[PDB]
């Protein structure tokens, strides 16, 4: 939701074209009283309560809550036997058929989320293999998220990724109140 | 719009077995968009319902209503197509099983009134439908006699049951 920006909009009776004059006098005509041909009651009139402008749904959960959610996702995958730890993502070949057959043989789910430490060091073989696959998605460690972890049936982590995630998520536990945004220099925070 | 009446002539029945009564022929004809009120056409339709083709033509030939000529033309066309295409042996061996008037597509016009006000005239159009069935016209439903009608009364008396009990 927080990224969502609904672009739906409707023209109110004020923004509808025309509708300035009174359609007919108050009395004597025998018709219903009206003040403009663009009021919501009229055909072609404005919308009384419609979507108004591009609306944002942005809201931020506490970073502790978000880290806790990441931890809970990891625990859920481990407990449900969908989490697999790898030494490295290096493949014998970059052929997607090899990766699909490997997953099927190891009884991984129809969808696999492979994670590597950094975008730059990701092996070329696995990069090529996953570039041509729809249900096998390869992401850097920083890109791990609850939504993708849930969408993909199985989650594959390398040992460096495990260490990195452990460090980052545990750091949220046993940290002070933020005196100022953590992007700013701190005594012990890289 | 609907045009099922025209299609009704295109239904083909399977061949009848020799030991089966001869199926009477049936011809569906119609005229669409007649400049005539369907209410006025209905009187002529009802008039000619259930009559032989010849009797209906005779009745319509001497009727002053405008729809009479149109209905006569439609009936003549129905007779011609019945003889030519529907394998009807005798022209006169046909009777009007169904004849109805349907509302057509109408046009809206303005009728100017006295004080700058107006009404919406409708240039009324109507459809006309006929089904011609081969064979002599069915006999008119005879009026129920006292004998049969008292028979019905006695049957109603006998049908009585002891209501609201075992």
């Amino acid at each position: 939701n927080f990224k969502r920006i609904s672009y739906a909009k409707t023209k109110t009776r004020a923004e509808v074209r025309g509708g300035g004059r009174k359609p007919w006098p108050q009395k004597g005509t025998g018709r219903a009283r009206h003040g403009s041909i663009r009021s919501p009651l009229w055909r072609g009139g404005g919308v009384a309560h419609g979507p108004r402008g591009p609306t944002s749904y942005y809201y931020m959960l506490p970073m502790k809550v978000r880290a806790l959610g990441l931890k809970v996702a990891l625990t859920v995958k481990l407990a449900q036997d969908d989490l697999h730890i790898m030494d490295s993502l290096e493949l014998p070949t970059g052929d997607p058929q090899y990766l699909t057959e490997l997953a099927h043989y190891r009884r991984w789910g129809d969808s696999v989320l492979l994670v590597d430490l950094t975008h730059e060091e990701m092996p070329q073989s696995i990069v090529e293999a996953t570039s041509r696959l729809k249900t096998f998605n390869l992401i850097p460690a920083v890109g791990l998220n609850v939504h993708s972890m849930l969408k993909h049936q199985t989650l594959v982590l390398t040992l460096p990724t495990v260490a990195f995630l452990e460090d980052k998520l545990l750091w949220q536990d046993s940290r002070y109140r933020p005196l100022y945004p953590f992007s700013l220099p701190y005594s012990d925070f890289p | 719009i609907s045009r099922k009446w025209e299609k009704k002539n295109k239904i083909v029945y399977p061949p009848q077995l020799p030991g089966e009564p001869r199926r009477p022929a049936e011809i569906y004809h119609c005229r669409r968009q007649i400049k005539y009120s369907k209410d006025k056409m209905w009187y002529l339709a009802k008039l000619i319902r259930g009559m032989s083709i010849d009797q209906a033509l005779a009745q319509l030939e001497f009727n002053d209503k405008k729809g009479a000529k149109i209905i006569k033309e439609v009936l003549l066309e129905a007779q011609d197509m019945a003889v030519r295409d529907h394998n009807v042996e005798f022209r006169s061996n046909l009777y009007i099983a169904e004849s109805t008037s349907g509302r057509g597509q109408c046009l809206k016009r303005i009728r100017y009134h006295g004080r700058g006000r107006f009404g919406i005239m409708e240039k009324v159009y109507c459809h006309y439908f006929v089904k011609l069935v081969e064979g002599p016209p069915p006999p008119p439903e005879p009026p129920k006699t006292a004998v049969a009608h008292a028979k019905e009364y006695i049957q109603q008396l006998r049908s009585r049951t002891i209501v609201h009990t075992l």
Partner: peptide, 16 residues
């Protein structure tokens, strides 16, 4: 007095 109101003409000069 209230003036009479005329409807748009197209509504009545429609044709097949």
């Amino acid at each position: 007095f209230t003036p009479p109101i005329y409807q748009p003409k197209f509504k009545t000069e429609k044709e097949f």
